[PDB]
Every structure is written in C-alpha cells, then in structure tokens.
Amino acid sequence: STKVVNVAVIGAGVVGSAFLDQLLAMKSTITYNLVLLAEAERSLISKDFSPLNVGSDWKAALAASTTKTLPLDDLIAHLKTSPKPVILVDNTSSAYIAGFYTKFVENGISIATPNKKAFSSDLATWKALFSNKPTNGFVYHEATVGAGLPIISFLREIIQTGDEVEKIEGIFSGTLSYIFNEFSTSQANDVKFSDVVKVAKKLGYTEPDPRDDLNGLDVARKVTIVGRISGVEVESPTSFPVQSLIPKPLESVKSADEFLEKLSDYDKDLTQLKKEAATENKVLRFIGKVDVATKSVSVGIEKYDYSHPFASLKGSDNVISIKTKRYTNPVVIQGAGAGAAVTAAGVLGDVIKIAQRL
Amino acid sequence: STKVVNVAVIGAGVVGSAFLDQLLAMKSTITYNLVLLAEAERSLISKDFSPLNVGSDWKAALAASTTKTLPLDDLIAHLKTSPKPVILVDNTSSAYIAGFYTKFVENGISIATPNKKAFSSDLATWKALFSNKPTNGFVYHEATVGAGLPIISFLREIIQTGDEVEKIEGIFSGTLSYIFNEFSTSQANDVKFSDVVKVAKKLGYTEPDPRDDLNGLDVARKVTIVGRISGVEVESPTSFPVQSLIPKPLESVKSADEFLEKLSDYDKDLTQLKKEAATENKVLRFIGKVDVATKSVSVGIEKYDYSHPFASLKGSDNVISIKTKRYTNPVVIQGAGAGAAVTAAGVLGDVIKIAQRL
Numbered sequence: 001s002t003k004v005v006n007v008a009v010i011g012a013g014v015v016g017s018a019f020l021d022q023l024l025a026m027k028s029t030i031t032y033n034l035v036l037l038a039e040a041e042r043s044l045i046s047k048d049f050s051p052l053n054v055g056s057d058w059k060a061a062l063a064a065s066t067t068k069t070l071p072l073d074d075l076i077a078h079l080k081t082s083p084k085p086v087i088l089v090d091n092t093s094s095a096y097i098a099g100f101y102t103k104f105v106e107n108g109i110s111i112a113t114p115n116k117k118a119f120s121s122d123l124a125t126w127k128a129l130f131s132n133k134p135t136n137g138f139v140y141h142e143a144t145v146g147a148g149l150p151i152i153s154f155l156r157e158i159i160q161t162g163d164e165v166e167k168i169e170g171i172f173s174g175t176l177s178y179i180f181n182e183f184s185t186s187q188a189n190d191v192k193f194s195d196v197v198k199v200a201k202k203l204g205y206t207e208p209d210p211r212d213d214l215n216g217l218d219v220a221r222k223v224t225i226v227g228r229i230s231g232v233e234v235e236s237p238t239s240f241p242v243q244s245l246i247p248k249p250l251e252s253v254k255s256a257d258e259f260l261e262k263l264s265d266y267d268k269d270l271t272q273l274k275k276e277a278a279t280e281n282k283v284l285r286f287i288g289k290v291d292v293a294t295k296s297v298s299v300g301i302e303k304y305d306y307s308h309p310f311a312s313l314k315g316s317d318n319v320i321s322i323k324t325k326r327y328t329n330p331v332v333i334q335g336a337g338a339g340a341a342v343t344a345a346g347v348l349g350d351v352i353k354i355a356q357r358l
Numbered sequence: 359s360t361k362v363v364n365v366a367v368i369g370a371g372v373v374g375s376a377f378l379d380q381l382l383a384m385k386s387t388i389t390y391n392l393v394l395l396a397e398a399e400r401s402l403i404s405k406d407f408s409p410l411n412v413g414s415d416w417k418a419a420l421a422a423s424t425t426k427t428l429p430l431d432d433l434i435a436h437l438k439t440s441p442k443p444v445i446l447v448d449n450t451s452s453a454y455i456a457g458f459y460t461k462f463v464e465n466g467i468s469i470a471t472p473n474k475k476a477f478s479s480d481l482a483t484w485k486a487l488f489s490n491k492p493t494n495g496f497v498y499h500e501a502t503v504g505a506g507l508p509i510i511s512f513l514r515e516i517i518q519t520g521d522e523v524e525k526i527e528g529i530f531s532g533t534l535s536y537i538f539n540e541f542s543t544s545q546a547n548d549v550k551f552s553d554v555v556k557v558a559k560k561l562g563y564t565e566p567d568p569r570d571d572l573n574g575l576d577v578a579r580k581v582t583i584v585g586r587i588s589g590v591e592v593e594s595p596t597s598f599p600v601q602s603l604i605p606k607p608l609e610s611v612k613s614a615d616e617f618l619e620k621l622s623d624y625d626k627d628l629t630q631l632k633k634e635a636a637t638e639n640k641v642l643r644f645i646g647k648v649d650v651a652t653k654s655v656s657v658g659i660e661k662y663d664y665s666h667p668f669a670s671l672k673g674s675d676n677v678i679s680i681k682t683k684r685y686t687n688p689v690v691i692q693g694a695g696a697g698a699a700v701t702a703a704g705v706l707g708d709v710i711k712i713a714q715r716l
C-alpha cells in the first residue's frame with residue numbers, strides 16, 4: 001500500500017511472541033515495516049527505518065544480535081527521526097516503560113499495548129495519554145481489559161455516540177474465574193479451594209507466584225481503567241476496597257512454594273463462605289464493580305443465584321456486564337480473557353486501528 | 359488525516375431520526391458536516407457543502423423543505439463535487455439504494471448503514487463491495503447484525519489478525535427472542551405460543567402484522583451476513599434451510615387480525631415440542647447457525663441446556679456465540695439487538711470509524 005507505518009516492538013515474552021507471529025503473517029493492503037524488536041538487553045534495530053529482514057525464527061535472529069537495547073530516551077529520539085508514522089507496541093508489563101508513555105505520546109509515537117501499568121497509575125498520567133494534542137500519537141490498549149474482547153473499544157464508541165455508562169460489573173481475571181468456576185458450583189461441591197488453585201497453577205493458568213493472582217491487585221487495575229473510562233476518576237488501584245484472597249498468616253512466607261503448600265490449611269475458611277451461600281441458592285465469584293452515579297468502585301467476592309449467568313460461565317472465560325442509559329438491560333460480553341493468541345490478536349487489532357487512522 | 363468530513367444522509371425514520379440527533383449533538387475533535395438530508399420526496403441540500411443551516415433543528419426544516427429528492431445517479435454525481443471526503447449514511451432498507459452502493463463506493467464515497475439489503479442479497483454484490491479497489495470509499499455496516507453490538511467489527515478484526523471462525527450460533531431477532539424467552543423456560547409452564555406472541559404485539563414488541571417477525575426472513579438475512587464474513591459463500595437468505603413460524607395456512611390469511619386470533623389453533627405442536635424439551639432439561643430457542651467446515655447455515659428452533667447462556671437471556675436481547683480456532687470456548691456477545699437509539703449509536707460508530715480513516 002501507499003500507506004506505511006513503522007512498528008517498534010518491545011517484549012518477546014508469551015504474548016509478544018504470539019504478537020510478532022501474527023504480525024509477520026498478516027498480509028495487508030497497508031504496509032507494516034517492523035523497524036525495531038527489543039527483549040531485555042538485546043535488540044534488532046533498523047537504523048534507516050527500512051523493514052528488518054527477520055522473517056521466520058525472529059526469536060533466533062534476536063538471540064544472535066550484537067545490538068544492545070537503547071535507553072528509552074534514546075529510543076524516543078531515534079523513533080522521532082522516522083520518515084513514517086510510528087507505532088510502538090509494548091508487550092511487556094514494565095512500569096519503567098509505562099513510566100515513559102507520556103514522553104512517547106507527546107513526541108508523536110502512537111502506542112498499542114496489553115500493558116495495564118500506564119493506565120492504572122495516577123489520573124494525571126491518564127489525562128495526559130488521552131489529551132488528543134495535535135502533535136500526540138494515538139494510544140490504544142484493548143488488551144488491557146478482557147484481552148481481545150472488545151471491551152474498551154465498545155465503551156469508547158458508545159460514549160462518543162452520546163451514551164452514559166451507569167454500571168459495570170464483571171469477572172476480569174482468567175485465573176480467578178477458572179478457580180471459582182470449579183470451587184463454587186451450582187451443586188453442593190466439596191473441592192478444597194487450595195486444590196483448584198494447585199490445578200490452576202500446573203495448568204499454566206496462573207502466574208509463577210499464585211499470590212500475584214490471588215491478591216486481586218490485577219482485577220483492581222482493570223477496574224480502575226474501566227472506571228476512568230466510564231467517568232469515575234479512580235485515584236488508583238488501591239484507593240478503593242479490594243479483597244485479597246491471600247490468608248493473612250501467609251502474607252509473610254517467602255517461597256511461593258511454601259505458600260501453596262500451606263494454602264490448604266485455610267480451605268475450611270473459604271469453604272465456609274461458599275457453604276454460607278445457601279442464602280438463596282447462591283454461588284460465589286470474584287468480580288470488579290463500578291457504580292458511576294455514586295463513584296463506587298470495588299473488587300472482591302460477590303454472590304449470584306444458581307440461575308444468574310455468572311453462575312454458568314466456561315473455563316477461564318471472564319465476562320463483563322455494561323449497563324448504560326441507553327442499555328437498560330446490560331450488554332454482556334464474555335469469552336477468554338487470557339492466553340497468548342487471544343491477547344496478542346487484541347494487540348494487533350489495535351495496531352491495525354492506529355495504522356488505518358494514520 | 360482530514361479534520362472535516364461531509365455527511366450525506368438518506369432516511370430519517372426510526373433509526374435515522376435518532377441517527378441525526380446523535381450525529382448533530384456529538385462532541386468530537388473532527389468536524390462532521392451534514393450537507394445533504396433526504397426523506398421521502400423532501401430533501402435538504404447545501405450547495406456550499408457547508409453545514410446545512412439548521413442547527414440541531416433538522417426535522418422541522420426537512421418537513422418544510424420544498425426541495426425535491428435527487429435521483430440516485432445525480433446524488434452520486436453531486437457528492438463527487440464535495441470539497442471534503444464524503445460519507446453516505448443510508449438509513450433505509452431499500453434494495454434500490456443498495457443496488458447503487460457499488461457505484462458510490464466505486465466513486466470514493468464511503469458508506470455507513472443499517473440497511474441489510476446490499477449484504478444479505480446477491481453474492482457478487484457482496485464481493486463487489488469488498489474488493490480492494492485503491493480509490494473506492496469504505497463500507498461499514500455494524501447495525502445490520504446485532505444493532506449496536508460490536509459483532510461485525512469484532513469478526514473482521516479477529517479474521518484480519520489470523521483467527522478463523524468455526525461455528526456461529528445466534529438469536530438475531532428481538533421479537534422472536536422475547537417470545538421464546540417467555541414461552542420456553544426451565545420453569546416449564548403451560549404458556550401457549552399464541553398468548554406470548556399476542557402479548558408481544560400488545561406490548562409493542564413486534565411489527566404491526568407479526569407475520570413479518572415469525573417468518574424468520576430478517577434472521578436469515580442477518581445469518582447470511584455473518585456466514586459470508588466467516589468465510590461461507592452463502593448465495594442468498596433463501597439458499598438454505600429457514601423455518602417459518604407462521605402456520606402453513608395463515609400465510610394466506612388476508613387480514614392481519616385473522617392471523618393473530620386464528621394463531622392459537624396450532625399451539626398444540628409448539629407446546630408439545632416445548633414439553634419434550636423440558637423433559638430433557640432443554641429450552642427451545644429460535645436461532646441462526648453457521649458451521650463453516652461443512653458450509654452449512656440454517657435458521658430454526660434448536661434445543662439448549664438450562665445451563666447454556668442462551669437459556670437465560672433478558673427481555674429481547676440478541677446474542678451471538680462465536681467459536682474460533684483461537685477461542686475454543688465461544689465468545690458470547692449479548693444485548694439489545696434493536697431500538698432506535700441503540701441502533702443509531704451503532705451506525706454513528708461506523709461513521710466515526712470511517713472519518714478517522716480518510
């Protein structure tokens with residue numbers, strides 16, 4: 001195509017690898033020259049912004065590189081000299097990098113990313129990333145919430161058309177969704193919370209240290225983002241009630257292994273609350289809630305009648321219910337909210353969106 | 359890209375009126391100028407291609423206009439003299455208008471529309487639109503399937519990134535959705551088909567003459583569209599199995615009164631199919647289905663488990679299930695699938711997605 005955009009990638013992790021794969025295989029009218037690939041200290045950099053001749057097994061080419069990664073300030077300066085609109089893809093979860101988004105944006109560099117950090121920081125940095133200055137680059141982050149699901153794009157669309165979001169309620173975590181779906185079920189089950197958590201770990205459905213999936217911290221970030229888009233100036237992921245499923249007695253312990261090894265000793269506590277559902281035929285489930293009218297945001301265990309939808313989800317599917325002035329009966333979008341492929345496509349979906357816009 | 363886009367609108371009915379109000383009250387960076395508006399024989403057109411001097415007051419002005427409505431050919435020609443990129447928004451359901459999309463597109467005039475005719479008719483008309491001529495305008499038709507629900511945009515993107523659709527199940531009719539949600543539940547009542555349809559009509563959930571809903575034609579057109587987007591070369595909305603709910607005799611009923619009162623005369627069949635389903639813990643749902651591997655599309659009644667997301671819909675929400683190579687667990691998107699404002703928002707969303715390009 002006559003249209004050309006240069007893509008600067010960072011992150012060759014699980015998501016990132018899937019991304020690159022999907023990008024390099026996408027045949028499109030528009031032309032996407034991969035001008036940079038960085039993973040930790042190594043990098044493949046095309047000084048003159050022509051497309052890197054990587055192709056198949058970029059992982060290897062990257063691995064064979066003698067090029068050291070540029071410090072972000074230097075990266076920005078470099079990217080500034082680009083002859084064509086630049087899109088920076090950040091497939092990490094780095095705070096450092098996120099800490100640079102405003103520098104990127106104000107310098108004409110657009111960003112596409114699944115990295116929730118920059119969007120779950122202080123409101124000031126948020127307002128800055130979306131000021132739409134003439135000289136600013138575009139900022140898309142669909143993968144930030146629900147992964148590939150059209151959560152952010154839909155919210156932004158209906159708000160532009162004149163709609164007013166009233167309430168959001170959803171399960172925004174694949175790990176926590178998998179867990180409760182197995183633990184708390186319509187049938188009076190008997191599975192020990194710690195058991196499904198051990199399954200979640202081994203099936204790869206969980207972060208190295210499951211405490212990182214259990215502190216709710218991640219769900220709070222996502223809800224901060226949806227809350228801010230819905231019109232609620234959430235100050236941060238800690239400025240509202242968030243319930244950590246971590247047993248106080250183990251907040252101490254150093255080894256993730258020790259934690260998981262002792263997690264069972266507290267099953268009788270969580271099983272209690274699942275047993276106290278009986279208050280109506282109800283099931284428990286970790287959710288993120290946002291009430292616009294009263295600026296109320298929160299994340300923690302919630303209970304629904306065996307008959308409610310949340311009581312019958314799929315594997316790690318994590319749904320979200322959007323109630324707006326126009327949508328009296330909420331919009332419910334559900335599906336996989338984790339996984340390299342699904343997540344990466346959400347990121348590529350955003351890259352196409354930016355490129356068509358440049 | 360352009361900061362000014364001239365909009366030409368045809369049709370100010372239920373969705374159009376709401377479309378026009380929303381467009382004209384839209385807060386936006388870009389400037390959207392309404393240069394031409396046409397309803398029946400009346401039309402408003404500014405030869406300057408400058409904003410129509412009506413403010414938000416377009417309906418009154420239009421109702422008073424003495425200016426005749428331009429022959430499509432002349433409208434194509436006229437829009438070809440717009441100082442700024444043009445977006446045509448066809449809020450009709452005219453097959454006539456549809457027959458001209460090719461020409462509009464072929465002349466760099468973009469289209470945003472709720473009209474299904476052009477995408478649910480001939481198959482070449484379909485391949486025509488979606489050719490990669492390098493000059494032709496863009497074509498967006500979100501409101502043709504799940505009203506404002508991000509159904510079409512989601513498919514296109516997922517496909518672009520490399521995912522492959524495998525199976526699609528969906529309830530694409532508000533009327534039929536409401537009816538079956540009321541008729542068939544897990545409660546297994548004695549509610550008669552006739553009754554619900556009568557109440558649906560009573561509460562204004564159907565067309566004046568309910569045969570227009572029960573015929574399942576609007577659903578086949580919608581399924582044809584997602585079938586083709588998915589990769590199934592569907593010839594027409596009548597080239598595959600489509601189950602009508604109008605009793606074999608009342609299709610020649612004459613009065614639209616006869617039909618409604620004489621309906622009850624065939625409740626027995628549905629009420630038994632409903633009894634057979636309950637016994638199996640299934641619920642009856644009217645749906646449109648697409649199995650890509652076997653290239654088989656269909657419309658009719660299918661049984662669903664009480665635990666299936668379809669057996670718990672609310673009011674008249676539409677719902678779509680999309681199973682893909684990547685999503686081994688179908689993505690499910692539900693919400694209102696009709697309504698003036700909601701459908702307008704969808705059309706405007708496309709208008710916005712178009713203007714951002716250009």
Ligand code: NA
Binds near residue numbers: 146148152
């Ligand atoms: Na998302």
Ligand code: NA
Binds near residue numbers: 509
């Ligand atoms: Na739609």
